Amino acid sequence: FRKMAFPSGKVEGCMVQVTCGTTTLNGLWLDDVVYCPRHVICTSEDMLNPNYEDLLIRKSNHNFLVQAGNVQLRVIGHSMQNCVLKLKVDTANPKTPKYKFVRIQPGQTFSVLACYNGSPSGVYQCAMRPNFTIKGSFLNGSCGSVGFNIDYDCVSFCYMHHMELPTGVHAGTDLEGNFYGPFFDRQTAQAAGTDTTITVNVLAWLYAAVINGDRWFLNARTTTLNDFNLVAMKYNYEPLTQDHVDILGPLSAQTGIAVLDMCASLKELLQNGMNGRTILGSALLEDEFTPFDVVRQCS
Amino acid sequence: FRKMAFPSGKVEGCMVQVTCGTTTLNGLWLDDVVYCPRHVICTSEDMLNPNYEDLLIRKSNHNFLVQAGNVQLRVIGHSMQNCVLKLKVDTANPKTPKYKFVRIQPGQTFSVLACYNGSPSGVYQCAMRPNFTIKGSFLNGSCGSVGFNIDYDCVSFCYMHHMELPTGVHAGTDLEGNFYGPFFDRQTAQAAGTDTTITVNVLAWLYAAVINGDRWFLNARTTTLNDFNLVAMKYNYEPLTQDHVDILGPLSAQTGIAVLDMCASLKELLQNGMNGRTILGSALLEDEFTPFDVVRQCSGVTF
Ligand SMILES: O=C(Cn1nnc2ccccc21)N(Cc1cccc(Cl)c1)c1ccc(-c2cnc[nH]2)cc1
Ligand SMILES: O=C(Cn1nnc2ccccc21)N(Cc1cccc(Cl)c1)c1ccc(-c2cnc[nH]2)cc1
């Protein structure tokens, strides 16, 4: 049972390099529009305290240099949507997949294609944390890298990378340019809200551990939904809803372990710890697999 | 510090499905040849005790269905090379990347593009265990999925999936059809030998920890490679080769920590444990990042 990302090919065909002055980052080229973080228009001094509408009005189309591989794309128009810059180019991307822009919920997962200078480096799976940060693998130059899910040949873009917080976690926006969380695109120190653990995901992963033959953490106790939620909140776990219980249904049916019986296992795990043991190779409780991620990989 | 697969687009454009009789599996289309596991020609009952040479003699080109999506590629030649079947097709793949076939060492990592009916489903990073199994994520119908590394847009293919073992680990061949490990393509009970920890990768991970400022485990001693190898084997760790010392060279130079000093620090961790401390947030020593994986993720290496 591994962390599994979607194949990246359809997104690879869309990655380009956007340059404004001496600032360079990645852009997403779909049809005849290139999307990228708007802080590409900032000098390093601008970034310290930018007024974006003021900075953008002073830019011309020729200030923007878009490179796809070794081809230069000509910018023929530019506008700004929230924190995203939209460059109209004179060429349509022949590799544009069927796509959608979506805003994901805390606790949902997505694949990230990490890119530098418009070229792909690696792909990995991430979750939107409850505090709206992501635990990414991004170096300097990765801004504009995107997160996505793929369903029946359609790419749903959900994340564009903008920054790294002082703690090393990452923040960004949806494809409409709205940050996830209370962050802003100004280079100043920003703390995130206190993070919590994605409970429905931990339960899914515990089910994955049972499907793969590991039952050491199970027990006989039972719990009610409310009583489990009392303990969950005490340990900074997100509440479990009745829809979460229903979503876990297929995993409950496959294993013959009622959802609330798995909650009693997790409650014992939180109150007693793991006693040096491991689950699915991990010594910590993993919360970045959703029930769907488990179902897709286990079936 | 998290696992990172290679971008999979160059391999996605090479995946096809191969059907013989009622058996469908994945194939790899490069130029005008499709490579796939030879057990596609077996029935499920044949698998119990196959004679591949006899099963192949009764096959003709017109018995093989190769499809790119739903589009048939006409087979115009066939042959068997070890445990892989090579089907010559009448169309050269225009998506063929620059590529090589390589045979990897235990401990080395690769990305696997898990596929079902020729359709890519997911990508993840895998290590070849010292017992020549991989702890992959494969369901039925994933046979023929390949593992690969990328180096400046040359794809090095290193693994083709053939089978699941009773313990749930996976076994396969290189692109020339030679199994990794003492396994065979017959459904007879086979078992993986006892596994060990990949020492060179644990050392790579300790170097990654030092790079990020987590260095409480650096001790004051050194060791010789021979002395270390004899001790490590008592803890079910692999011995180091001369190639292992050399591939740790760049991390040793970047951190200023001699390889044999890091071996001495690891030895102390084995003999005394962690004392409830963590490394890179982990209470366990990670052994599925190679030295190359550490550098690839710490630099912005693109392809
Ligand atoms: O963190 C990043 C960029 N970044 N992203 N991932 C990273 C991983 C490692 C290192 C840096 C990373 N920041 C800081 C920042 C702080 C608060 C808010 C924001 Cl939006 C950015 C940044 C973004 C733009 C510029 C820039 C634009 N023109 C000139 N200079 C300079 C710095
Ligand atoms: O394990 C697998 C295949 N497999 N691989 N990953 C898997 C993940 C989930 C489920 C199955 C998986 N085996 C059993 C086997 C035992 C020892 C050696 C070998 Cl080679 C195979 C197999 C291989 C071919 C056939 C077959 C050929 N024609 C028609 N049916 C039938 C069974």
The ligand 2 site (C-beta within 6 Å) comprises: B 23, 39, 42-44, 47, 138-140, 142-143, 162-164, 170, 185-187
Q: Which of the following is catalytic: A36, A39, A78, A263?
A: A39
Q: Which residues of B48-86 are buried (b: 16+ CB within 10 A; e: fewer)?
A: eebebeebeeebeeeebbbbbeeeebebeebebeebbbb
Our mutation pick for probing the ligand 2 site, out of B164, B167, B180, counting the most ligand atoms within 8 A of Cβ, is B164
CB count within 10 Å of CB A276 equals: 9
| Helix/strand/coil for B114 | strand
The ligand 1 site (C-beta within 6 Å) comprises: A 23, 39, 42-44, 47, 138-140, 142-143, 162-164, 185-187, 190
Max CA distance (Å), chain A: 69
Ligand nearest to the CA of residue B187, numbered in listed order: 2
One-letter amino acid at A1 equals F
Find tokens 């802080």 and name the residue. Answer: A39
Kind of pairing, strands B98-101 and B154-164?
parallel
Q: B137 and A8: CB-CB below 8 Å?
A: no
Q: Where are the domains of chain A?
A: 9-173, 199-298
Region class of B236: left (phi > 0), else alpha (psi between -120 and 50), else beta: left
| Helix/strand/coil for A207 | helix
Distance CA A266, CA A272 (A): 10
Show the DSSP H helices in chain A as ranges. 9-12, 44-48, 52-57, 199-211, 225-234, 242-247, 249-255, 259-272, 291-298
Distance CA B80, CA A22 (A): 56
The kind and range of the H/E element at B37 are strand B33-37
| Helix/strand/coil for A253 | helix
State the Cα angle at A230 between A225 and A233, rounded to 5°: 115
**HEC assignment per residue over A52-66:** HHHHHHCCCHHHEEE
Task: Report yes or no: B2 and B280 within 8 Å, Cβ to Cβ.
Answer: no
Architecture of the domain delimited by A199-298: Orthogonal Bundle (1.10)
Shortest distance, CA A223 to any CA of chain B (angstroms): 30
The protein residue with its alpha carbon nearest to ligand 2, atom 22, reads B163
| Helix/strand/coil for B43 | coil
One-letter amino acid at B244 equals H
**Is A120 touching B (CB cutoff 8 A)?**
yes
**Is B94 touching A (CB cutoff 8 A)?**
no
CB count within 10 Å of CB A223 equals: 19
Q: Return all residues near A216 (Cβ < 8 A) that are at least 6 apart.
A: A277, A279
Q: Which of B180, B182, B285 is nearest to B237 (CA)?
A: B285
Let me know if the fold of A9-173 is the same as that of A199-298: no
Q: How far is CA B59 from CA B35, B53, B77, in A?
A: 16, 10, 11
The resolution in Å comes to 1.7
Q: A123 and B123: CB-CB below 8 Å?
A: yes
Task: Report yes or no: A124 and A134 within 8 Å, Cβ to Cβ.
Answer: no
Distance CA B288, CA B205 (A): 9
What's B181's DSSP letter?
Answer: S
B11-173, which class in CATH? mainly beta
Distance CA A45, CA B268 (A): 48
Task: Report yes or no: B35 and B27 within 8 Å, Cβ to Cβ.
Answer: yes
State the Cα angle at B179 between B174 and B180, rounded to 5°: 85
Q: For the structural domain made of A9-173, what CATH number should be given?
A: 2.40.10.10
Kind of pairing, strands B146-151 and A170-173?
unpaired
Distance CA A161, CA A168 (A): 13
Q: A4 and B123: CB-CB below 8 Å?
A: yes
| Helix/strand/coil for B203 | helix
